[PDB]
Amino acid sequence: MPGTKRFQHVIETPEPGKWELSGYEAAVPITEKSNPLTQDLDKADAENIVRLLGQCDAEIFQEEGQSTYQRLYSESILTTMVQVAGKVQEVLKEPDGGLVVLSGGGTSGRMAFLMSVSFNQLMKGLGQKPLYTYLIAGGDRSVVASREGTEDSALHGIEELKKVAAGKKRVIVIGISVGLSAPFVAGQMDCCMNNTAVFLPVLVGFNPVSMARNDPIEDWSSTFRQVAERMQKMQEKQKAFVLNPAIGPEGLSGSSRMKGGSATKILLETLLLAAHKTVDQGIAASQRCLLEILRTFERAHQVTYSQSPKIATLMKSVSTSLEKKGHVYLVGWQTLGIIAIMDGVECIHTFGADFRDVRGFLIFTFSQEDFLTSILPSLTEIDTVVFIFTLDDNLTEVQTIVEQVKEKTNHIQALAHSTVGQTLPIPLKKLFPSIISITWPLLFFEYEGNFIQKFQRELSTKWVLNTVSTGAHVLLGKILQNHMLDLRISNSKLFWRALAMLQRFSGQSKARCIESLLRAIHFPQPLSDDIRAAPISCHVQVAHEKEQVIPIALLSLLFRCSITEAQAHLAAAPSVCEAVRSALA
Numbered sequence: 309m310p311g312t313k314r315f316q317h318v319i320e321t322p323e324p325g326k327w328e329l330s331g332y333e334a335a336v337p338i339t340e341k342s343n344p345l346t347q348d349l350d351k352a353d354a355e356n357i358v359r360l361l362g363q364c365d366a367e368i369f370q371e372e373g374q375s376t377y378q379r380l381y382s383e384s385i386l387t388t389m390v391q392v393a394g395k396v397q398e399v400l401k402e403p404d405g406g407l408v409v410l411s412g413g414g415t416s417g418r419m420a421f422l423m424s425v426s427f428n429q430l431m432k433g434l435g436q437k438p439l440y441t442y443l444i445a446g447g448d449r450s451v452v453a454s455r456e457g458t459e460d461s462a463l464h465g466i467e468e469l470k471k472v473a474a475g476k477k478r479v480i481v482i483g484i485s486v487g488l489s490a491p492f493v494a495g496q497m498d499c500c501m502n503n504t505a506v507f508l509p510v511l512v513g514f515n516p517v518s519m520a521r522n523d524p525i526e527d528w529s530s531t532f533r534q535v536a537e538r539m540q541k542m543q544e545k546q547k548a549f550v551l552n553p554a555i556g557p558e559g560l561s562g563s564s565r566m567k568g569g570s571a572t573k574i575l576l577e578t579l580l581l582a583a584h585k586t587v588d589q590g591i592a593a594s595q596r597c598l599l600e601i602l603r604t605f606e607r608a609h610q611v612t613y614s615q616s617p618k619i620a621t622l623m624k625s626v627s628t629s630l631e632k633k634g635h636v637y638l639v640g641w642q643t644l645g646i647i648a649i650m651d652g653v654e655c656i657h658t659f660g661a662d663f664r665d666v667r668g669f670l671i672f673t674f675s676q677e678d679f680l681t682s683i684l685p686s687l688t689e690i691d692t693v694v695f696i697f698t699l700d701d702n703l704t705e706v707q708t709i710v711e712q713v714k715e716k717t718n719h720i721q722a723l724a725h726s727t728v729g730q731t732l733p734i735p736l737k738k739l740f741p742s743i744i745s746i747t748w749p750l751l752f753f754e755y756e757g758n759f760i761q762k763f764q765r766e767l768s769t770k771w772v773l774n775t776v777s778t779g780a781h782v783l784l785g786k787i788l789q790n791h792m793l794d795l796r797i798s799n800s801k802l803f804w805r806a807l808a809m810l811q812r813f814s815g816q817s818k819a820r821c822i823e824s825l826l827r828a829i830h831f832p833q834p835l836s837d838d839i840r841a842a843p844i845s846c847h848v849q850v851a852h853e854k855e856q857v858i859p860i861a862l863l864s865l866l867f868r869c870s871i872t873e874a875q876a877h878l879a880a881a882p883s884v885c886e887a888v889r890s891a892l893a
């Protein structure tokens with residue numbers, strides 16, 4: 309029938325109460341699952357939120373139970389990390405013709421960028437040619453942009469990969485798809501497998517291969533699941549690797565920028581840092597070298613979330629300043645200003661939030677006096693500015709900008725990384741009364757840029773910014789239980805997630821849910837057979853441009869009514885959230 313092939317993979321909606329025993333629920337990839345810890349995130353206050361997400365973040369480090377999924381500290385995973393590290397060594401030994409690529413859509417691509425820099429720095433500091441580079445879906449514009457649509461072409465991924473692999477003789481391609489989902493990555497991995505002489509694919513994600521996307525890719529004949537299954541076969545001969553620990557579901561469902569990206573860093577910095585530090589020691593990388601690093605990262609979570617109460621406060625002040633109609637600024641020096649930018653930009657697609665809502669700033673890249681003249685004018689009684697730095701930064705530049713912002717804002721808090729025994733200049737740094745000083749033990753670094761300290765610091769900041777930005781929005785009633793219902797359908801993955809949410813909250817049939825969403829997307833044109841049979845990109849291209857698509861579709865399903873009727877109902881309610889919540893009642 310028209311539509312049958314396109315929606316073929318979509319499991320039917322369970323009957324009421326048999327949600328567990330239809331095993332629709334066991335096919336929901338871990339990455340898309342609803343984390344049980346956050347059943348009621350829409351009711352937690354700011355302090356609970358920080359707890360529950362700090363709890364969710366912890367599941368990264370949790371170990372394997374006794375018929376269940378391999379985890380970060382499982383021996384199969386660590387054994388793979390070792391083997392990969394070893395393959396990076398082969399390349400570090402022969403850098404003439406060598407290249408290491410870290411590739412990913414969205415936050416995966418963002419994380420790939422940061423990392424590729426760090427390991428480029430580390431070889432600069434040893435007088436070695438930088439071997440790292442990155443690819444991000446939609447080119448480098450994408451790194452600091454919201455560009456969700458760009459992950460859907462396998463050909464694109466392959467083109468970006470063909471460019472960079474120039475006339476290199478040995479290329480390690482680390483494709484990062486948290487959900488083992490993005491066609492961008494898919495293509496690359498497959499391309500790698502077709503030319504084993506030159507390429508080595510390593511696939512990073514956080515689902516078992518059996519939960520890897522298996523829907524058709526528009527410009528490609530295989531699915532991620534097939535590509536991934538075949539890589540798993542080649543691992544037996546060390547010509548491909550799959551690094552896929554389960555870190556548990558995201559505190560906000562499907563928001564892989566959070567635990568996903570954190571784990572992407574934890575997992576890869578660890579592995580690569582081990583590989584470098586062990587080559588010039590003349591030693592092979594062991595599980596012991598990796599575990600030192602893993603446990604340092606695990607400490608970082610404890611170090612970070614021990615400031616919970618103050619994190620909860622920054623949230624309350626970001627929540628509030630948005631609750632009015634004010635803006636929030638994240639002002640960071642070096643890498644922590646990037647991470648600031650990346651958090652803020654992600655708020656657009658993740659929350660339907662304007663690019664001013666939570667903006668990030670690096671000293672997007674507007675230096676001291678430039679920031680002073682340009683932006684400082686636009687601040688207000690209600691805004692919130694957030695300073696993010698270390699004590700090794702140049703706090704003469706820092707103190708200045710605070711002094712100025714203080715005048716016009718007064719809602720300023722800060723995020724300050726320090727070793728023990730560094731002290732915050734100006735005993736009257738009461739510009740910040742109750743800082744978030746995050747103070748790091750002394751650690752036995754050997755490399756000159758002290759890269760372990762770097763990686764700890766980024767991640768700690770990422771957890772903070774992530775929890776804060778996420779929490780503020782949750783507090784404002786915009787999340788439904790632990791799902792973003794009202795997202796913007798801007799790629800195929802989000803189209804399927806929308807459909808899954810309609811099935812969940814309506815309980816009504818797959819076919820009904822599909823019919824309601826397509827109607828919502830394409831209204832005022834009614835369902836033709838063309839539309840039914842169209843490639844999901846057609847739906848995406850049309851949905852991406854409209855507002856409240858998913859809520860409207862859900863309202864039509866519950867009230868068993870037309871798009872016309874549901875639109876008019878909506879418009880005649882105080883808000884989208886209030887409308888949906890009481891239709892659900």
Ligand SMILES: C[C@](O)(c1ccc(-c2ccc(S(=O)(=O)c3ccc(N)nc3)nc2Nc2ccccc2)nc1)C(F)(F)F
Binds near residue numbers: 319805806
């Ligand atoms: C938990 C929940 O039921 C839900 C939420 C989302 C999804 C869902 C979202 C996206 C996708 S996806 O096709 O884009 C995808 C993404 C990554 C991957 N490795 N494989 C497939 N699938 C979802 N559900 C699903 C996928 C495969 C089999 C059964 C269910 N399914 C269920 C809801 F409450 F959110 F509705």
Ligand SMILES: O=P(O)(O)OC[C@@H](O)[C@@H](O)[C@H](O)[C@@H](O)CO
Binds near residue numbers: 413414416489564565
């Ligand atoms: O890491 P994946 O599963 O390949 O997905 C990559 C991107 O879709 C993902 O990073 C998305 O852009 C973020 O907003 C996650 O909230």
